[PDB]
Amino acid sequence: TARGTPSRFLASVLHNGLGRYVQQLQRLSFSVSRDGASSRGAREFVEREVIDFARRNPGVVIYVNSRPCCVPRVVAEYLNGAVREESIHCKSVEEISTLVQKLADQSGLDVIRIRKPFHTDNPSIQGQWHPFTNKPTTFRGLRPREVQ
Amino acid sequence: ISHGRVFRRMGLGPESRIHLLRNLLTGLVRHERIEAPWARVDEMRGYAEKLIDYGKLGDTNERAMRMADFWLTEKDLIPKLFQVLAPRYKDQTGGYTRMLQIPNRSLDRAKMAVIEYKGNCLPPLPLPRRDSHLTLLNQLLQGLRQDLRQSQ
Amino acid sequence: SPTELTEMRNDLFNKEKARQLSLTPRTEKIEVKHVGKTDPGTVFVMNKNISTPYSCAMHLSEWYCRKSILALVDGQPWDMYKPLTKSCEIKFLTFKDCDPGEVNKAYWRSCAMMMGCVIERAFKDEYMVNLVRAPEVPVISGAFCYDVVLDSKLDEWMPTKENLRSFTKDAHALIYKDLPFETLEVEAKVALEIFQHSKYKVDFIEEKASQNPERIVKLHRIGDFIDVSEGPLIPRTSICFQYEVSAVHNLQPTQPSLIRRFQGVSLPVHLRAHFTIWDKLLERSRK
Amino acid sequence: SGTWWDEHLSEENVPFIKQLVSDEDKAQLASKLCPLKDEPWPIHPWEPGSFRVGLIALKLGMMPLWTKDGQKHVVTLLQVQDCHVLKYTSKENCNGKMATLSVGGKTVSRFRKATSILEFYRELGLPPKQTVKIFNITDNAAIKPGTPLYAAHFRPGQYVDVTAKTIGKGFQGVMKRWGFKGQPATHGQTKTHRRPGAVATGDIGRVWPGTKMPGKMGNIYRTEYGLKVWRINTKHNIIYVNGSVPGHKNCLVKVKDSKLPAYKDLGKNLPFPTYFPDGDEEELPEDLYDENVCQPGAPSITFA
Amino acid sequence: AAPKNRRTIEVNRCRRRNPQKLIKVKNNIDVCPECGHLKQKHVLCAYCYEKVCKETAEIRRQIGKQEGGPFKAPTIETVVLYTGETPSEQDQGKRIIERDRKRPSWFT
């Protein structure tokens, strides 16, 4: 629920698309058990999908190890320091590919209510409204019901 | 409404009130100092004063003798009243008893009070003195004593 | 340029204070026996030249610290903040003892020093104020006096009541600030080798110790202020609660200069005096 | 912190301070007895539609007093003690109503008051009063603060209104407080003898505000109107007001001219601004009497 | 009648911790300036009063031991004398209640 949940404003890491786009995900750790039944989709992903993903994303360092011994997991680390874990136990190779792409396609901010859908740093060009725009002025700057 | 009623209400009625105060007064005449609940002592102080007043008239008077017969229960004390207390206060015309408040009672946390007949033999109660005459405020007031006396 | 004269005093004051405090050879111990009817027969074990009588008072109870106003060691008054020096005997003097003589004297000379630290900065910098002395007067007199000399340009200026009100407000600011009365034992040469600005207290400085066999003198410091007095002072300026400088006097033999004299009267927080009694006391602080 | 005046004084100092402050009080009281040798204010002749200050008296007790027509008339004794006009506030200082005077009564100790009140009275040169009351007067009735007021301020033959704090009965049930016919005795009225009946009707689920119910009684200010003045004792400053007056004995009451719309006139023959004993106009005797009082020392009445 | 609803901890806290129900800090305690014990102003030093009651009880025990039994209120004054105190010139003809400890400093 909104009231019962944090929130943030719409933002980017380092003005990402301004100069040059940079890919925020920088490290991806796969733990895949060589024997466990829950590590089957993970084993398929590593055997026939991780090389292609590594080639398509050369800014991400992908480590894979075989010592959880019962449960797999993927831990994604980002430029801005954020970590994000996702379960891949008992999932299909399609699901794991979709998930890993999702991880590589987002900035490491928090997935919480974005208050505004548009963030602008220079919201005004003609000058933000104040009660004296569109209001006349009178001779010598007199207030109403003055004399001098 | 209780406007202008000077007598406390205690005991099981008026009579028990007189009897309670009578026992307190007898204890006071026998020992010359007793610790009792504060309100009861404050009620008994007037009676002890007037008892000394009646005792000054002396044995020969019969009204005083009847009164001291009622208000003293162990009669060995009636001699004392007429031969040790009343003679002792031949000078004072009032205020024969001093009444203080003391630490509340341990059990029922009642307001206590020690009451005694002035001049007895007992070790003296720790009365509270006033501030020494040599304290700063008193010294300034003494200077004002002098300076006002000379002017007048 | 008085605003640098204060610094020129305080820097050397702190210098001597530090050089004295650094003479202690690795925290030696002294024994202070306590005498008096209250809590008698205790033996404090203190530090030879760090612990003060307060360091002893706090050992006993907050009551002793709150009520104590001066300390007898070897049966002579000894300020509360002044460090001890040797295995001694101690007792604490308050305002409500039977004989508050020494305490009253200390209180009134402390009030004199406070009035000094108030008057000196009271005037416009273009004038030149020079503190003469704190003439010791008995408490019975009716007010404490402080002799100062104003610059000759003010002969036609007898202070008006409003300016006395300003003096009182400033003194109340000083007490409200709650500064302590630090003390310092110093060889008499500071007054003869540095303090050239001593023009009228140049007389007092020999009165410090020329009379006594030793060649050491006492300095008292409120804080960014220094002055000598003839005895111990009360520990904090908060002790005073009611305070007022009433009027001023002049001494007729006006050959050297106009020796203005300032009168004031005060009481501690303990011995507060009711409003009307205080008015009566003030009326007599004008003699 | 917390303390009273003579807590720290020594044994031989309390009597002196008592004597000194009492002497100063007497001196200050005496140094205001002549308000015309000081600087008075304009004394205008009375004209219709004006109002003049009143007094703060102290209720002594009651007595009878008969009349030449043969009837009886209880009266109440009001002693004017130290009644001084204390303050003045201007017509538009109260923002339109009238001019006002603050009058005080019944000198009190000075060790038992707040600092502000002591400052006020010190600047005014008087010892503190007990009750201060505000009288609404016209502009021309002004009196300089510091002047005294005296029982001769009134004269017999007029009517006068008196306001005071009634006697406090404490918390009272409903029949002692509002005259409620409680419920009968036996015939079985168990546990209901002196009780209110139905507090309110049934359809409304509330008790109206202003319903008569148990609670504190008396001890509120209230006014009696139309009391006539029979006698004045100008040596002890007593006023003999007809009928009974609220309050208990030795409690301060506020006396002023009758405001009822049948005595609006007859403020003329009264001394308008006040009575000044220093006017020296055929100095008043010890007792001023109404035209119809069988005063003592006179022959016993006869009806022929 | 009976309650219609439980009362919450909030209402109960606004009642129980209201100032009117709190224990007031006492502004009238101080220290016996000579004896140095705590006391209220209008009340006797508790320690001093106890040390007085002890001596009163000892004196009264001696009085009882001398009077024998009940119903023996003497018809003369009484004076109490501690060790090494001969009956003064004013106390002849007054019963003496001897005690066997040095007179207390506070006994005048």
Place this chain on the structure above:
Amino acid sequence: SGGTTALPLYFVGLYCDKKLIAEGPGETVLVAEEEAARVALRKLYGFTENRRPWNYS
């Protein structure tokens, strides 16, 4: 607007020989003058709010 209250608004405008060169808001007239100086400085130094945004392409 609101000259006497505790929440005033003063709009102070600098001029240079009968021609405006800035305009600033504030609560005190001193602060409004300071802000008018700041906006005039920005206009002269070419650093306004609506300047030609930097050209990253």
Place this chain on the structure above:
Amino acid sequence: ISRKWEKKNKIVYPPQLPGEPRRPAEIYHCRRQIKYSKDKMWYLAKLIRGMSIDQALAQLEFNDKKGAKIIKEVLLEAQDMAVRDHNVEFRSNLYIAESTSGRGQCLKRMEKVYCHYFVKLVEGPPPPPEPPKTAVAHAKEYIQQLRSRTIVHTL
């Protein structure tokens, strides 16, 4: 049954550097199974909440409630332990940092109530009370709130 309070007198901090401010010492102490309700002991516990030890003892010596002497004995034992073991210098240089009363165990007949009393004494002088909110502070915070308004629900 949890004995946590008396275990906070065993946290051994690291030896201080000669630079950092001297750390104020502490002592935690508790009385268990006080035959007294908790809703009554709470008033005494709150009375002495923010005052030094000596003033607390003074205030308790002259209070009427039964738990006053229990709190007093607890505070005296705490002071003695603080000086004797926790290397406090001046036995008057302590103040009641935390005072609270808690429920107890024993059985019924009608509950037979019990309660514990928990006190934390912190070395040093009492901290001054929070001063009243002066009118200038109220105006300052109202201005702060008026000066943080943004245009709501737009760019």
